[PDB]
């Protein structure tokens, strides 16, 4: 009887702290699905949006009377809980989905504002040829002043107009992002840019500066490799790229396939680390699919770096299929 | 044959923003025990709470009973740091567990981390240790007390202790504790307790073996081709992936000898796009080495590998 149809609701409980207020070594998240009309159900856990493998959780369904109830328990290390990740319990039931999320409760006193200033990316500098720098202001407490953000150059020369975006975050904080276009010649010849930040709730101004990294230059070497085919990887293959011996550390790494620049999200790429000698190195890992290599069996690891010649780029291709 | 009751308390979680709900539920679970007389009483700071504040119920499944009691608290009361005790009396014997609001994880901007043993130290060296690290504490007066304990309450050995004033003017305290190889593998919980005169209260971290699924690493090793201008050097790269849990040790061997840790680097474990973790390890080698013997071994030590927690792959510079 339709009038008796009962939709699931979703609630997450967590392992309690002890009598001292301390976390247990492991945290259980228990996703409870309230009594609902019987019918196929599936529970999926997400970590910061990413599907977690079902291995990490267990699910149990009970029916008592005319209502079904389901719970799923996810177990996490204290370390991971304390890293402030967000976990989502996703329930799919007869069509649409229901969900709930949780993370470590926020600390008592939200701390103060901080600001970060980034250099242009090599990609923007050399490929797009529209370099910008970004001043990011975080941990703002809303409904106060406005947070003044002013750009200037060491030379005293004029700055271009910047864009400004304010975003309310889930944890209740505010971030303010200002992006400033910089002259290409200006940047490359060593101009210094300053972001100056002020707010009523701030005692003295925050001042951040950025300029091209000085010192020795060296071009990157690029090497792309495929893991072998084996029973555990018949319709997917893992590619890897090692980029090394470059200086300074500023580099942009992308994977290209079939005239498309793949989304950054597709690969896991390390931040530059010093070699055992001179220069830096980065590793990139990219999992590809059969559909991709059957479309075009060519995957290109490309590095953009000021010291690569002729055109600030070095790349290597890898194929996974004999043809 | 007889299964005694155990007690555990769960509670309403904070939302995706880390915000508290309007009310807090505490749920005391006594799961899977031999049926018998049972009572669940809640205490607030040691005093029995009114009967109308909680509702207890019991069900039977096969040879076991399961009991639970739900207590609802105002956010205000939870946030006031009162302690709540679930007091279970089963066949005239009392079992208790207690909870209060989780304390700040980063008081005064301080952070504290606690590691698990390295698989190399645990399985090869047979002398596992864990390390408690505390960062960003003020160089004010008073000493930083860093004490170790086991959840079981069994003895611990002495530990190392090192404090260093950092370039940014902050202070970090490090302590390393030797643990029982068997004690650790069997699931002991180790606790690092930090007290700073400037800190409001003791800060604790706890660690124990993974309880998740296990999966052995796949190891693949590659040699860079010669790069123009670099005739007498090559780089070896080792991709180790799809292992679980994430704890892993990597070594390289050449001419049957394990190379010094300083010869190579390994990335921090990170998730693959599906199950498990991966790391990359990198080893620069010289013509003199590969001409002496052209075989280099990338070896992973991991609890899921067998027979002896080890899986490896050799690579050569030349065909
Ligand atoms: C003032 O200057 C000091 C300089 O020392 C800074 O202190 C550093 O702060 C960082 C960040 O807090 C510390 O990094 C943390 O290290 C933990 C322990 O790892 C050590 O031990 C393991 C295991 O043996 C080694 O593998 C590792 O190399 C270290 O030796 C980690 O467990 C922490 O992990 C967390 O952060 C990482 C970031 O990569 C995340 O990926 C994890 O998910 C997790 O959240 C963390 O990495 C570091 O130890 C400190 N350096 C030193 C030398 O002590 C201060 O931060 C700085 N203060 C200010 C205000 O700038
Ligand atoms: C409430 O919620 C928000 C998130 O919604 C949190 O805001 C984050 O706060 C952290 C720390 O304050 C911010 O981390 C900083 O990010 C900078 C920018 O990152 C991007 O841009 C750079 C430059 O283009 C890229 O390199 C990078 O890949 C990102 O795309 C970094 O530049 C900063 O790095 C510095 O600190 C880190 C510490 O991790 C060091 O490792 C670095 O070496 C360097 O010193 C820094 O990481 C983060 O950007 C914020 N996220 C936002 C705004 O979206 C709040 O922290 C949270 N509040 C509470 C109470 O937790």
Curated annotation (Swiss-Prot), chain B:
Protein name (Swiss-Prot/TrEMBL): Immunoglobulin heavy constant epsilon
Assembly: The basic structural unit of both sIgE and mIgE molecules consists of two identical heavy chains and two identical light chains; disulfide-linked. N-terminal variable regions of the heavy and light chains form the antigen binding sites, whereas the C-terminal constant regions of the heavy chains interact with immune receptors to mediate effector functions.
Domain Ig-like: 5-103, 107-211, 217-316
Function of the molecule: Constant region of immunoglobulin heavy chains. Immunoglobulins, also known as antibodies, are membrane-bound or secreted glycoproteins produced by B lymphocytes. In the recognition phase of humoral immunity, the membrane-bound immunoglobulins serve as receptors which, upon binding of a specific antigen, trigger the clonal expansion and differentiation of B lymphocytes into immunoglobulins-secreting plasma cells. Secreted immunoglobulins mediate the effector phase of humoral immunity, which results in the elimination of bound antigens.
Keywords annotated in UniProt: Adaptive immunity, Cell membrane, Disulfide bond, Glycoprotein, Immunity, Immunoglobulin, Immunoglobulin domain, Inflammatory response, Membrane, Repeat, Secreted, Transmembrane, Transmembrane helix
Cellular component per GO, a single term: extracellular space
Disulfide pairings: 28-86, 132-192, 238-298
Entry's Gene Ontology BP terms: adaptive immune memory response; adaptive immune response; antibacterial humoral response; antibody-dependent cellular cytotoxicity; B cell antigen processing and presentation; B cell proliferation; B cell receptor signaling pathway; complement activation, classical pathway
Topological domain spans for side Extracellular: 1-319
Glycosylation sites: 39, 145, 157, 168
Gene Ontology molecular function: antigen binding; immunoglobulin receptor binding
